Write a protein that binds this ligand. Structure first.
Ligand SMILES: COc1ncc(-c2ccc3c(Nc4cccc(C(=O)O)c4)c(C(N)=O)cnc3c2)c(OC)n1
Ligand SMILES: COc1ncc(-c2ccc3c(Nc4cccc(C(=O)O)c4)c(C(N)=O)cnc3c2)c(OC)n1
Ligand SMILES: COc1ncc(-c2ccc3c(Nc4cccc(C(=O)O)c4)c(C(N)=O)cnc3c2)c(OC)n1
Ligand SMILES: COc1ncc(-c2ccc3c(Nc4cccc(C(=O)O)c4)c(C(N)=O)cnc3c2)c(OC)n1
Lengths: 332, 332, 332, 331
């Protein structure tokens, strides 16, 4: 008569699979910052952690487990073996190759490709109907990589993309205006990183367009040098890395948000990295960031935004550049 | 006018004084875990980070800010100068002195004293009605230190104590019983240490005593070896640290729980560390963990747990030890 | 092409399968009070109302729908037809028979059987895998009813039972002690209503038995008349009804909590009305509240509270009372 | 030795002003949806219910109290005396006259006035530093009336105005588009009710104007009749009423949100009835809804919307109309 029995009468052995599970691949700073942000936005009923640093993984699982009482996520798990990811709704990939000192962009991508050849097939093996959210950098390329390898349909392979840059862009637009980032509205689209496109037209507060009111906005003659708000957005990760080593907190929150729209099927619009062949006179299997309706099927629809002849040509080059790398990868 | 000004008539510029501010001191893992935890329970309208490493500090401020859009906490600030702490409701001290290979228990506490000699009277100079939460270890003794230096009354100086220690005890209880830890109950009391006292008299589910059910519970002849659960409670920071380098996430979640009860005036009972001279035959100015009613003036009352002679001795000895260390500190 | 198709390019034909759908039968005060508290606890990706009063139902639906902007539950639907309930995980029944002055108690019960005859098989026709939460009164009979009619296994039919009663009990207990109900513990078990049993043994704060401490607790010699804390609990429903005409808000929150546990698979222990034929020397086919663990599978296990042969006697006499009514009900 | 004595050692007390206290005047369906909606978004530490029906008041208070276990708002107090409202950071008024079959516009607001000379003075008497949120009934005037009687700075007297109207417009915009309301943007401003102006120019998703993408949007010669959405916005409260009796749920969540902005100092922008003596022609003391930044100081700044001469001149007339009533009042 063990105590667990004396105390509790079981009605029902049954039960196998969980309902709203989320896997986070790789437990870096970014990894865990996603993990804590997801825990505390009560988005999953089971959370799986995967990496290859066996002892680190186990530590992060334990540390989180011990705060269980203060959370409404009842089962947390880890393992170097992907069987623990089984039946995930959403699977977030933060894992990748750490940059070497001399290393070409291609090599870094390729070594990411060779990693993704182990991870992505294992993810889809165990969670064949999952949506894949790629956070790893360079994200617009690695999203492609994980698309190619998974063979998931485009709607189920989503890049963190510019969801964070747009978040920074609004934070900073807010600082200037004395307004909360929620009420400040602006979009950074295209290649995540150095050559992203800050869409000045679609900036506004309460619906009164900044570009209309200030025609010179987003340009060199711009008395108010609003083009420097873009630059802060691009310089951001770097000046934060230079300051503290990495980014983590905002990326975690940014991803948490994305998972929320996916997990609760909210059909909100975020700018994420997605397969924009055909759109904007781009002809290659290339992922770029564009305002997308996220929900339980991942990206169900995407918003055709009006870019200038100018802003269009940016995305073109971003994608020529991208394909220029993408076509030298080795999958077989 | 500017763009700001043709879009936004100003009705009145006004000196805001912050209404529900929370300062966090030290931005190590425990530092930031407490801040990310607090940020996401929306417990404050202004967070202030303070440390001595300006570059690190400032990175963390920005990386927090950069997901301001995802948060309902509109002002985040950081500085090395304690004026950024102005008007805090609750100040949380994670900061301290870093142990030195062969350093002595007491010498370590004295460097802690010196640091608190700077940190504390600055904190009180700029938020003289604040509550102090001491998270920094050795907790029970450093809570005494900040009380003695702050000149605050015993109710506004609070140690993070065994609040976490008990949360672990309940996680573990939970995983053994198959019940959420919200619904498994148990109290780890006394020195947040190896000496921590697992009160078996109290362990219940749904108010059914585990002791009256299986009276070997917590004893050497206990075939279910329930004592191990406590051992595991005691050795967790060690096992986690060994596995991941530090601990953070549980302690952060735990502190935010206290922050909730304090900031939200809840009057829940948590096991924190407070002055308990008088109780359980304790005679000296010592601090230990005892179930406390927490609310907006910190500790208003504290629950009188009944203890077996052995348990009472444990606590007394705990206090004997701690007075032992406290009595060779040097303040002035 | 229309404006919509201009703006938004779609990718996927929305299957539109709903994941965490909840339905509310009856849009009473209680029905909406559940609906609104569920919407505010982000527990569903689709809510469905169903009642016979059509002009009313549509109105409630349209109003909830209008606050859509401040909720994260993207699809709220209503209908005379139970076809809208389809794919519900949880179906919460508030519907029932409005009492008639002079009617026997048996008839009222019977009229309720007679509308569950229409409701329940309509609910299981469209959502064969759902969990039934019965809130309707008398709740322990109508659970037996829904259970018999549904033919669902016992674990997927749950009475609202004495969940609320214990929340009142805890509330009141806290009043006296000066503690939040969260930290005051005590369990009210058996038949929801005049015969419900306060289990004094299990009353505690922090792990300390009030019953041990004050062994008179809840007899009549009790200088503190703690027995009144029960009577206030039973007469609370009546007392509110006399003052505003019904209760809605507390029962609302109480049901949102049951839902949370079920929908999030928390396995927290709630005192809900389940089948207890087998325990407490009951050999009928009766539903009474007992502390149950609540999961995605409904009631998975249940706690075996130790009762004084007195407490047992009431429970047994409740079950006769109840069966003697139940055995007279017409069903086919 | 009481049980308390044996269980709880008691430390010395210090005093205790409540720290984030919200009071709701009027426990009608609107009042109470405001009450529960605030309780669930954990915006207060004290909630005060006040009205004149006193049996009802105490019943609603007990009922909320019994759910205390499921909330983190540890004091709910009610009463017919306005001392229960003391130290309210935010006080939300729903009380007011109820129009009768016979009544005209001008008599109903003169009564609202008289009821307000009882309530408003009493609210300030015990919480002189509150922000009045007027939900009342006929808002853009009663907000004026609270402002005049309280004697408070224009910023601390805020009408719900078209806050709710905009959320209804966003829901509907939402509908046609296949997009959550959070990600749909559009604004209804001015006289809450029949005269509310849907700023077609400002309608968008992801910053792409609809007026620019489909130039007959919201005009009469519109193929997919988008004007109907804004008809529907004025229709809805006056249509649900038809269907259910009153409106509650949406108004509650609307107010709650304004409460969140106020109580946490979000400086989020909200279309609220504020005193726009200075814009659009309006050289008159009137409140109308325009987008405003709600901080902890009430309405701290506002947004100057560019408007079609059609839109300007509707507000202009909204404001003429309102001053035409307001001038005939007396205090
Ligand atoms: C033969 O099967 C097998 N098993 C494991 C791996 C493998 C390689 C790298 C991995 C990986 N990254 C990693 C591992 C080692 C070095 C580096 C680096 O920075 O170069 C990066 C991660 C992660 N968290 O980023 C996670 N899992 C990995 C897994 C692998 O190769 C990709 N192949
Ligand atoms: C009176 O002037 C003055 N000014 C600053 C400090 C001081 C020293 C150490 C501090 C401190 N820790 C710290 C700093 C430097 C060294 C060490 C260590 O133990 O090696 C520890 C922290 C923290 N995050 O732990 C935070 N603030 C500090 C502040 C100080 O220390 C007594 N005194
Ligand atoms: C077989 O066809 C059919 N169709 C509809 C009903 C029926 C009866 C009562 C219902 C019902 N109860 C109800 C409705 C109207 C009046 C009464 C009453 O007791 O006066 C009770 C409710 C509810 N919200 O309580 C909701 N749906 C109902 C539906 C019904 O009941 C036998 N049968
Ligand atoms: C001078 O003493 C005094 N005492 C009480 C009131 C008074 C009047 C109207 C009130 C008031 N309105 C009200 C009360 C009764 C009837 C009506 C109506 O128009 O039918 C309107 C409300 C509310 N819930 O709307 C709440 N409190 C009130 C309180 C009052 O105002 C005239 N004056």
């Amino acid at each position: 008569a063990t105590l667990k029995d004396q105390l509790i009468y079981n009605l029902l052995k049954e039960e196998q699979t969980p309902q709203n599970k989320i896997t986070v691949v790789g437990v870096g700073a970014v990894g865990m910052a996603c993990a804590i942000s997801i825990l505390m936005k009560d988005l999953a009923d089971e959370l799986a952690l995967v990496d290859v640093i066996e002892d680190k993984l186990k530590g992060e699982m334990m540390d989180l487990q011990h705060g269980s009482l203060f959370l409404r996520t009842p089962k947390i798990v880890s393992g170097k073996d992907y069987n623990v990811t089984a039946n995930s709704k959403l699977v977030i990939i933060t894992a990748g190759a750490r940059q070497q000192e001399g290393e070409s962009r291609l090599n870094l991508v390729q070594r990411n490709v060779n990693i993704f050849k182990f991870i992505i097939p294992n993810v889809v093996k165990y969670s064949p109907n999952c949506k894949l959210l790629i956070v790893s950098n360079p994200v617009d390329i690695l999203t492609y990589v994980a698309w190619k390898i998974s063979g998931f349909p485009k709607n189920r392979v989503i890049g963190s993309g510019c969801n964070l840059d747009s978040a920074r862009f609004r934070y900073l637009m807010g600082e200037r205006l004395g307004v909360h980032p929620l009420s400040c509205h602006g979009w950074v689209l295209g290649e995540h990183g150095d050559s992203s496109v800050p869409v000045w037209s679609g900036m506004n507060v309460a619906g009164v367009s900044l570009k209309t009111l200030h025609p010179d906005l987003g340009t060199d003659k711009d008395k108010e040098q609003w083009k420097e708000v873009h630059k802060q957005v691009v310089e951001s990760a770097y000046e934060v890395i230079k300051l503290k080593g990495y980014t983590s907190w905002a990326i975690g929150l940014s991803v948490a948000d994305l998972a929320e729209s996916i997990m609760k099927n909210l059909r909100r619009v975020h700018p994420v990295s997605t397969m924009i062949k055909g759109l904007y006179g781009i002809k290659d299997d290339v992922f770029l960031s564009v305002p997308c309706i996220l929900g339980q099927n991942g990206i169900s629809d995407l918003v055709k935004v009006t870019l200038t002849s100018e802003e269009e040509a940016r995305l073109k080059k971003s994608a020529d550049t991208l394909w220029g790398i993408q076509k030298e990868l080795q999958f077989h």
